[PDB]
Design an enzyme around this catalytic site. Sequence first.
Site, PDB file in Angstrom:
ATOM      1  N   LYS A   1      48.656  33.346  34.926  1.00 35.45           N
ATOM      2  CA  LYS A   1      47.475  32.491  35.131  1.00 35.45           C
ATOM      3  C   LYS A   1      47.966  31.040  35.157  1.00 35.45           C
ATOM      4  O   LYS A   1      49.017  30.741  34.578  1.00 35.45           O
ATOM      5  CB  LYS A   1      46.492  32.670  33.965  1.00 35.45           C
ATOM      6  CG  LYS A   1      46.026  34.106  33.741  1.00 35.45           C
ATOM      7  CD  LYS A   1      45.073  34.575  34.862  1.00 35.45           C
ATOM      8  CE  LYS A   1      44.808  36.079  34.756  1.00 35.45           C
ATOM      9  NZ  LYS A   1      43.860  36.560  35.786  1.00 35.45           N
TER      10      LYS A   1
ATOM     11  N   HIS B   1      45.575  47.805  42.566  1.00 32.56           N
ATOM     12  CA  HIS B   1      44.427  47.038  42.097  1.00 32.56           C
ATOM     13  C   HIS B   1      43.187  47.591  42.779  1.00 32.56           C
ATOM     14  O   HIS B   1      43.231  47.919  43.973  1.00 32.56           O
ATOM     15  CB  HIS B   1      44.537  45.583  42.514  1.00 32.56           C
ATOM     16  CG  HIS B   1      45.060  44.694  41.450  1.00 32.56           C
ATOM     17  ND1 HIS B   1      44.306  44.306  40.359  1.00 32.56           N
ATOM     18  CD2 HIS B   1      46.266  44.085  41.312  1.00 32.56           C
ATOM     19  CE1 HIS B   1      45.022  43.499  39.597  1.00 32.56           C
ATOM     20  NE2 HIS B   1      46.214  43.345  40.160  1.00 32.56           N
TER      21      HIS B   1
ATOM     22  N   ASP C   1      48.800  37.948  40.440  1.00 32.32           N
ATOM     23  CA  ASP C   1      47.399  38.280  40.300  1.00 32.32           C
ATOM     24  C   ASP C   1      47.024  38.949  41.636  1.00 32.32           C
ATOM     25  O   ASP C   1      47.740  38.799  42.615  1.00 32.32           O
ATOM     26  CB  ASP C   1      46.536  37.057  40.026  1.00 32.32           C
ATOM     27  CG  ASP C   1      45.323  37.399  39.158  1.00 32.32           C
ATOM     28  OD1 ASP C   1      44.967  38.609  39.051  1.00 32.32           O
ATOM     29  OD2 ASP C   1      44.746  36.477  38.550  1.00 32.32           O
ATOM     30  N   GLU C   2      45.921  39.688  41.681  1.00 32.32           N
ATOM     31  CA  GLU C   2      45.548  40.398  42.903  1.00 32.32           C
ATOM     32  C   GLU C   2      45.368  39.559  44.156  1.00 32.32           C
ATOM     33  O   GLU C   2      45.618  40.042  45.261  1.00 32.32           O
ATOM     34  CB  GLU C   2      44.317  41.305  42.692  1.00 32.32           C
ATOM     35  CG  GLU C   2      42.951  40.603  42.617  1.00 32.32           C
ATOM     36  CD  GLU C   2      42.619  40.092  41.224  1.00 32.32           C
ATOM     37  OE1 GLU C   2      42.747  40.849  40.241  1.00 32.32           O
ATOM     38  OE2 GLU C   2      42.222  38.925  41.102  1.00 32.32           O
TER      39      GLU C   2
ATOM     40  N   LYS D   1      35.990  42.106  29.276  1.00 33.64           N
ATOM     41  CA  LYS D   1      34.993  41.302  29.974  1.00 33.64           C
ATOM     42  C   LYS D   1      34.299  41.967  31.152  1.00 33.64           C
ATOM     43  O   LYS D   1      33.265  41.476  31.615  1.00 33.64           O
ATOM     44  CB  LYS D   1      35.609  39.954  30.412  1.00 33.64           C
ATOM     45  CG  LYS D   1      36.613  40.062  31.568  1.00 33.64           C
ATOM     46  CD  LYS D   1      37.420  38.791  31.794  1.00 33.64           C
ATOM     47  CE  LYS D   1      38.350  38.991  32.998  1.00 33.64           C
ATOM     48  NZ  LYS D   1      39.437  37.949  33.113  1.00 33.64           N
TER      49      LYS D   1
HETATM   50  O1  LIG Z   1      41.453  38.355  37.413  1.00 35.83           O
HETATM   51  C1  LIG Z   1      41.324  39.071  36.384  1.00 35.83           C
HETATM   52  O2  LIG Z   1      40.247  39.125  35.734  1.00 35.83           O
HETATM   53  C2  LIG Z   1      42.575  39.921  35.967  1.00 35.83           C
HETATM   54  O3  LIG Z   1      43.723  39.323  36.481  1.00 35.83           O
HETATM   55  C3  LIG Z   1      42.714  40.046  34.392  1.00 35.83           C
HETATM   56  O4  LIG Z   1      42.919  38.769  33.740  1.00 35.83           O
HETATM   57  P1  LIG Z   1      42.892  38.504  32.181  1.00 35.83           P
HETATM   58  O5  LIG Z   1      44.011  39.467  31.692  1.00 35.83           O
HETATM   59  O6  LIG Z   1      43.358  37.121  31.915  1.00 35.83           O
HETATM   60  O7  LIG Z   1      41.583  38.932  31.661  1.00 35.83           O
HETATM   61  C4  LIG Z   1      42.518  41.352  36.722  1.00 35.83           C
HETATM   62  O8  LIG Z   1      43.607  42.159  36.324  1.00 35.83           O
HETATM   63  C5  LIG Z   1      41.209  42.159  36.374  1.00 35.83           C
HETATM   64  O9  LIG Z   1      41.386  42.704  35.080  1.00 35.83           O
HETATM   65  C6  LIG Z   1      40.891  43.275  37.364  1.00 35.83           C
HETATM   66  O10 LIG Z   1      39.747  44.046  36.877  1.00 35.83           O
HETATM   67  P2  LIG Z   1      39.710  45.630  36.699  1.00 35.83           P
HETATM   68  O11 LIG Z   1      40.954  45.883  35.823  1.00 35.83           O
HETATM   69  O12 LIG Z   1      38.466  46.004  35.960  1.00 35.83           O
HETATM   70  O13 LIG Z   1      39.914  46.213  38.058  1.00 35.83           O
END
Ligand SMILES: O=C(O)[C@@](O)(COP(=O)(O)O)[C@@H](O)[C@H](O)COP(=O)(O)O
Lengths: 123, 123, 467, 467, 316, 151
Positions: free
Chosen positions: E16, E135, E44-45, E175
């Site tokens: 991040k 993802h 990140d995605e 979250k």
């Molecule tokens: O952008 C975000 O929110 C994250 O990078 C987590 O960040 P944090 O670790 O800082 O929370 C993704 O990995 C989400 O978790 C995807 O959701 P899901 O796993 O439900 O597909």
Amino acid sequence: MQVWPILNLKKYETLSYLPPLTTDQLARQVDYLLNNKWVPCLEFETDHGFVYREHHNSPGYYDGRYWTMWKLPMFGCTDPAQVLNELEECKKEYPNAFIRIIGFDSNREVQCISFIAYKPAGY
Amino acid sequence: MQVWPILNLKKYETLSYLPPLTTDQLARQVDYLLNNKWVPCLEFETDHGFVYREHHNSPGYYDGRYWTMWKLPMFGCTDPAQVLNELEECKKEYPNAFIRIIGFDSNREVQCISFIAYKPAGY
Amino acid sequence: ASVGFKAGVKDYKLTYYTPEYETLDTDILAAFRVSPQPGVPPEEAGAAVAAESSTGTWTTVWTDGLTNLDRYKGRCYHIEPVAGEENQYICYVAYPLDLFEEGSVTNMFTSIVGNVFGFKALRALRLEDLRIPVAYVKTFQGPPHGIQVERDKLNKYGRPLLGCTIKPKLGLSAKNYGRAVYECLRGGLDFTKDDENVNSQPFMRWRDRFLFCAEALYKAQAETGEIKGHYLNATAGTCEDMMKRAVFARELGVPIVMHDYLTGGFTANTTLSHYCRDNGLLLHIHRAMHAVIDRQKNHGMHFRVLAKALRLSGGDHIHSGTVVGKLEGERDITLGFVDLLRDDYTEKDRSRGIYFTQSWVSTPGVLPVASGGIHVWHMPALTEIFGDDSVLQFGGGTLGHPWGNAPGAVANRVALEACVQARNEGRDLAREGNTIIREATKWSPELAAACEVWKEIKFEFPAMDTV
Amino acid sequence: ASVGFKAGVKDYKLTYYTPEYETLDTDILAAFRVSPQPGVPPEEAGAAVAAESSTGTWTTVWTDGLTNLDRYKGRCYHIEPVAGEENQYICYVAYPLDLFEEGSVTNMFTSIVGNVFGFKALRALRLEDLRIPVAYVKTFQGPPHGIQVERDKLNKYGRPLLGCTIKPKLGLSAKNYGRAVYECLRGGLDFTKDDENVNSQPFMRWRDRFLFCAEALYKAQAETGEIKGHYLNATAGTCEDMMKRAVFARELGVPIVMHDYLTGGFTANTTLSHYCRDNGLLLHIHRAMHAVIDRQKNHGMHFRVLAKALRLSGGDHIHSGTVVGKLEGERDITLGFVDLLRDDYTEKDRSRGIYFTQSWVSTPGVLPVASGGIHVWHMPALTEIFGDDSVLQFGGGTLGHPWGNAPGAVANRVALEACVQARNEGRDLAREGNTIIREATKWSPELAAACEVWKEIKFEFPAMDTV
Amino acid sequence: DKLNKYGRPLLGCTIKPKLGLSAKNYGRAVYECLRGGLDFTKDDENVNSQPFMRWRDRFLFCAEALYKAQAETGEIKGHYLNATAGTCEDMMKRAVFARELGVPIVMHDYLTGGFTANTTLSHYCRDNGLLLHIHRAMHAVIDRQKNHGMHFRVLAKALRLSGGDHIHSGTVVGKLEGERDITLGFVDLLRDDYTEKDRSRGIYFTQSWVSTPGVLPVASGGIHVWHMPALTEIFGDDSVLQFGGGTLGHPWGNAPGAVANRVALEACVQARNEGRDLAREGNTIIREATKWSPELAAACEVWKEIKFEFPAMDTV
Amino acid sequence: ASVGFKAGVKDYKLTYYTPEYETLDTDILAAFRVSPQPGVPPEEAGAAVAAESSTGTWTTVWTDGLTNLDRYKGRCYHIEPVAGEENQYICYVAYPLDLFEEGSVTNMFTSIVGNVFGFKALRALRLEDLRIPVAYVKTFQGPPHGIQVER
Ligand SMILES: O=C(O)[C@@](O)(COP(=O)(O)O)[C@@H](O)[C@H](O)COP(=O)(O)O
Ligand SMILES: O=C(O)[C@@](O)(COP(=O)(O)O)[C@@H](O)[C@H](O)COP(=O)(O)O
Ligand SMILES: O=C(O)[C@@](O)(COP(=O)(O)O)[C@@H](O)[C@H](O)COP(=O)(O)O
């Protein structure tokens, strides 16, 4: 604010970030493995205690993953004392080796337990 | 005609061809960094003080560029004494490490300052 | 809505002089310094330039009625007389975005500068600047890496980078080239380089040179502990030959190659720029031949236009002049295009010859390279003019040192660092320059020997290209 | 034999001014029009040009002693004042064959014209001519086909070829482009063509254009019984894009493609020239941007040098000017370089600006193309100036005809044939030109209508580029 | 087997801020996280190739950083390099460079990239020995509401067929939405060879996989050290727990943030193995560990009161 | 200019709710129909959407100080209630051009629509429209032919 050390901080996978296991803590881990019906086995290594890449650099290839088998997996073992006994015996024969205890799940054919049980001097 | 030496003449990038910095000269460099509103940060290395190529030989790839961060960048620092203080603290903890001071420009996201502030014995 | 077709010739100003036009943010704008023949009104001359570089020809054609010429035509929307010049005007022309092929500098120049300079009705014509809209900028890759990434790959921060062109220009064997290279690099220079005309010749074939230079650069890097590079020239006669040379540099694992973008050409340069981005190679660009085009104030294309074109096509470095060296370059004009090469945004500033505000929407900046007749005494001035983000190259200034290459390199590195330290301490490089160099000679024998040799060498002549 | 190394700067004339030198038949010779700054002797200026474009730099370097500079250095061997010009001289410089990369026009220009035009010590510099030795000429492929082969493939003999550029320059759709093409070709023109800046744009993508133009040209050929062609533009932003376009033209089986050699570049042009030779495609070359470089007499490079470079790199046609049209071109200078493009041997002739005798050792000739503001009344003059081996192009001159494209084409074809017949019968095109055209209007309604429209259109202005 | 990791959930961390960091700063963050005990770090995605950081530069610096952390710690490390791209060709170029670097794992956004592209990548990964992290970006646009769309369990089955070694499965306690029973239902559908119909977990049909390999579920999104006992209890050893803000939000930096997570995880694994109830004794297990781990203690102070509790939209 | 790093969680609205922001012609604009959970203010919900689809996460990270978050962050710049709808709002979010990969619709959707629809703090979310700036439009080929060419 403490700075995480850089020197002589090699780790050994599962359980290696916790304080060293006492005799009882070690026995508890062995009990856990036997209670789950996994097959215990000891492995030791004297030359390469850590992963490296000498023969190939392709994805997923690393040297040093295989260690050497102490005798044979203990099929049918139901007593933790037998495992701890083999550990002492392996230690007397190889005081200079890293020794780990692993437990096999034969239905899935995956090691469900793996932890360092003994480290040579200066480690 | 003097012949430029070949042995034990490793260099350390910016400012390394000048006579060693005195305490005051060092403080002046830190002032310069803070006056430009750059964020100071210390990095140290004990194992590989110079660039090498172990894991790859492709264009632009070198090992040894990354050193380890001492704590965190000093966001909001406005006093050079704070930086020099961290330097002394890093030196006491890692007397055998090379230590450099860098300054970040966050708008361009480029290090605008980088110089060796301490070298271990025999360097 | 359509009117009939009337064959015959009409004045260009009837369709192409459009003083009430408000430019769109998607238009490419051009500022032309026009010198009409006697009897040709400036409105007609500007309109002729706009017509001929966009949609029109010399007589009325019926096919105009098949499209909507209003949306495609180039338009001369403003004209202003040039002060202190006889019958010369700055004509501003707007070109709709649709006229240009995406990602092609070749196409952009073909339209704007293709045929208008030869009109019998003009005595002279010079393109001074172009406002490239952000929508067109986004269709280009730009530099393969750019300033930030380059400093990060090489781990070099806080000072201008130092280079050296091997001399004599031509005539050295591959092995002697590498020998000179190792000696220069080991003394403190970050880079050495093939001269612009060193491609592949009877006295030294390219593959032999690449091989020996790689051996030499690796030896200097191991000796000093600082990352080194030697720009290997990929300029060639065909696209295929150029690619073969870039490919071997990739195989050797070296960090940087070079290309002469004007003599090699935009089409070839863009291909190389893309290859460098795909293979992690830094690309140094030479502007060989630029002065044939940009020297005279009355006719040609100003260098700032050629600099913008390179930033779009792609290059990590580009020669930008020295101001104080052997080749022409006025200070203010130079600072003007250096900003156009490095920054993300440059506001209109006629005192520096910047006719239009230019934004780059995060296209990477290009490192300007000062090269040509410079030596140790020019160090304070160079550091002051260019700042940290530049490459200073000393060919004769290194190989002309009385003790050889390594000491010549030391002299330049010490002089540079003395200036950086002084500047950082708050000293005025402009007022204290000579003093800073003299102080350093007290402890650096290598610098002292260089200073003695070039003490009285200056290059001062009236400039042809002035604002 | 070697003398010690003395660091320091020496005058260029000590090593590079060599008035007693006899040129070798393997040397590349250059004639530079040099204008020195006040206080710079012509011998020093000529020597500086020779040094900087070959082996030297601004200060003495020890590495010169590793080679034999005498065999590699460029040499100013002759200087002559220019009549009726203030402080201007023609300096002749000789360059050994070994300095150049075989088959690379890019390398040749990089050396000769790379950095010298920007010397602070010169006010201006112009390259007027180059003597390319036969030994260097043989390292180039030259035109993919050349005059003889082109006439043989197309089965066209005994008259200039006729073409037409589609207008408006930009703005037409692919389908409308083909519609205009068919109408022009069916009326008697041999060729139609993409304008130089028509590459691939939002209003018309290249592949759609190639497809519709092929349909149109095949229809016109079937209708008339004469072989037709439409120059498809391969000019692009990268070597890869350029090749994709040439490849699709090959697939369509059409006879000719085009390229803008200066805006696309020499490296890309040479690649295309080789591809055309390997695939049997004729290559039409546009000189877009040339006037930026060759218009002014005091600075730049004369077109004759750019014409020689194209004949080496490769092209079957090259625009050469019209003399009588809208763009500049003086008669004698033009006839001079037209001979340099078509003939196997051209003797020195200063009255036509030919500084050196040039031999081509059977390198094919290039067809000159007259295009730009010409119409039916210029036909006698064009035929007289260029002769049969030329291509005459009428863009506005065809699409500006009151009855449309086919009649516009007929008017041009009839006017041309009337001139060829008259000339063949012994009539003086120069004295009887207007009479020959008038006679033809009696039986050709199409020609009569064209003549009425353009009767008073002439382009007469003082030329900037004169001998 | 390839990574030599057994007996505990794997640990990862998303760098991040999501976007905005340069290639070199990305690698710097990566090395610091990995050296503290995390097994993986990741793009990140939405980090593909952008003006602030082009993909090839990132791949290069991340490889340098991961190799340095691996040499320092002696444990195998990985950094998921994102191959998601605008065309099949671009996607392949990125996967190919990862192969050249010899790294162990790449990632793909299967729904935004698409099934056709994902299947191509899955085959390439099998042929070249690369692990493939998946993802599920965009899934909630489709699967959140109970009345309309497609349940995530269907999207999870589709991924197991098309191909992926890991797939995000939700955290339950974080979250983003995810109810416990429904989640356990599809986690079984992802890992096991056979799952019997069970309407209480939303499993409408019995499903057999005839030895198709299982996929590792990945819990990511708003989780921190205090959630460790619950995560370990819900997912068990075969899972990957990812802490983005939970690592880079630590007051002492990345390495200590990584240590806090690794220590918390191992404390839970040891406690569970000894017979302790993670559900009843969770907070006690974490508190005990803070007595000897300053890094964990500092993390616990910061996130002590952070919980994410809201009514779920997707219920059985 | 930089302030210290304070670990901990802060409301998204402190950084991502920016009602005084004037959109640039290079920004990608999004109109979201947001339905917050009870007790979540519309400004916080809109800010959460903007943060999570651009640069932010749930707690403060020190790395924000290495860049200039002001030039990269997504921003909720306008909120309006939906008529005849209970606790539903149209939130407008601006995304700088630099966040997107040229010519990639896949990348554009991954950011804007990747994770926000699953936030526990929202009951529902719908993306209604996107203003694609001409500078981004030019990075795409678009239709292979289009209406005119096809006819
Ligand atoms: O952008 C975000 O929110 C994250 O990078 C987590 O960040 P944090 O670790 O800082 O929370 C993704 O990995 C989400 O978790 C995807 O959701 P899901 O796993 O439900 O597909
Ligand atoms: O041939 C030369 O003159 C140089 O090799 C410099 O040599 P010296 O270092 O020995 O002077 C070129 O780099 C020019 O500087 C190019 O000009 P510009 O940078 O103006 O494009
Ligand atoms: O854009 C133009 O002006 C033309 O299309 C001619 O149009 P018209 O036939 O309608 O005049 C070009 O062929 C120029 O002639 C090129 O100049 P040069 O031949 O001198 O290189």
